[PDB]
Amino acid sequence: HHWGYGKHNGPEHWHKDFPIAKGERQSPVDIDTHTAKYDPSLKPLSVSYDQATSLRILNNGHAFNVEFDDSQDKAVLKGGPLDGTYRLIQFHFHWGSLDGQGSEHTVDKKKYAAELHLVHWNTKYGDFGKAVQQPDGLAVLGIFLKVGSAKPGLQKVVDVLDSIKTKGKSADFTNFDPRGLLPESLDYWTYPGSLTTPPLLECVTWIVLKEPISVSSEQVLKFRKLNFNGEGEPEELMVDNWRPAQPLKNRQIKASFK
Numbered sequence: 710h711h712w713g714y715g716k717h718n719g720p721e722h723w724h725k726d727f728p729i730a731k732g733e734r735q736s737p738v739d740i741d742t743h744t745a746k747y748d749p750s751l752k753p754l755s756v757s758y759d760q761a762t763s764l765r766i767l768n769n770g771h772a773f774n775v776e777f778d779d780s781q782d783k784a785v786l787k788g789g790p791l792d793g794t795y796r797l798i799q800f801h802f803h804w805g806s807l808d809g810q811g812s813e814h815t816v817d818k819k820k821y822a823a824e825l826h827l828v829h830w831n832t833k834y835g836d837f838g839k840a841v842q843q844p845d846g847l848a849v850l851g852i853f854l855k856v857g858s859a860k861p862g863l864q865k866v867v868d869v870l871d872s873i874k875t876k877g878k879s880a881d882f883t884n885f886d887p888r889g890l891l892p893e894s895l896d897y898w899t900y901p902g903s904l905t906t907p908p909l910l911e912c913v914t915w916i917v918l919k920e921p922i923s924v925s926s927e928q929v930l931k932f933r934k935l936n937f938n939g940e941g942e943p944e945e946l947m948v949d950n951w952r953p954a955q956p957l958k959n960r961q962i963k964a965s966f967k
């Protein structure tokens with residue numbers, strides 16, 4: 710009876726195994742754009758993905774992850790609200806059963822169809838597993854998806870999905886360039902928060918881009934054909950793998966623009 714997003718093990722349940730679910734710096738949150746403080750001391754974000762080495766794509770039973778070689782400074786996030794250098798380890802999405810829901814963060818309570826998370830760890834801690842134990846261990850770049858025009862840079866991901874339909878399936882996924890998933894502007898909001906799945910650790914500096922990317926209806930429909938279950942188990946479509954907004958508590962969301 711492990712955690713999930715089903716009818717009996719979803720976000721409302723997670724606190725029973727992971728009590729930090731009711732903590733003081735949980736994610737996601739609603740971004741109230743009028744209350745967010747413009748901070749002129751924030752720097753432009755530096756996203757250096759030219760040398761990114763993607764390796765593999767994996768259905769982990771809760772999303773799909775595109776994994777990168779993070780054994781050298783190859784794809785790093787710096788600047789913005791960050792001190793030091795954070796290395797890209799993987800990206801994944803959260804999405805809905807319908808175009809009207811799917812994002813984890815919301816903007817003035819607006820839900821987007823999906824949300825992309827580019828997960829990076831602080832190289833001062835040496836590896837991802839040590840970084841998640843630290844308050845400034847991770848930096849997750851969050852990008853909203855809306856349904857409209859296709860995102861050409863997403864299509865290679867969409868086309869490999871039927872090779873990883875079920876939980877535990879993986880596929881080689883080399884030479885994928887994550888710059889193809891960025892919007893034009895790097896304006897952002899930032900706040901201190903957490904992982905949005907168990908173990909819900911409070912180790913994340915969140916950086917959420919204001920500008921969503923557009924993906925086509927056919928592209929997000931393909932995300933919704935994935936399965937939460939393993940091969941030869943009854944089919945449970947992988948949809949609605951997002952956690953609702955959590956109480957902001959004693960936190961301020963800062964804007965880099967405005």
Ligand SMILES: CCOC(=O)c1sc(N(CCC(=O)O)c2ccc(S(N)(=O)=O)cc2)nc1C
Pocket residue numbers: 769771774826828838841849903904905906907908909910
């Ligand atoms: C024992 C301590 O380990 C951890 O805290 C984590 S978090 C973590 N993952 C990726 C793998 C998976 O998704 O199954 C992860 C989950 C949500 C996020 S999110 N949604 O907050 O960006 C980022 C990374 N892996 C590990 C081992």
Ligand SMILES: [Zn+2]
Pocket residue numbers: 801802803826905
């Ligand atoms: Zn995520």
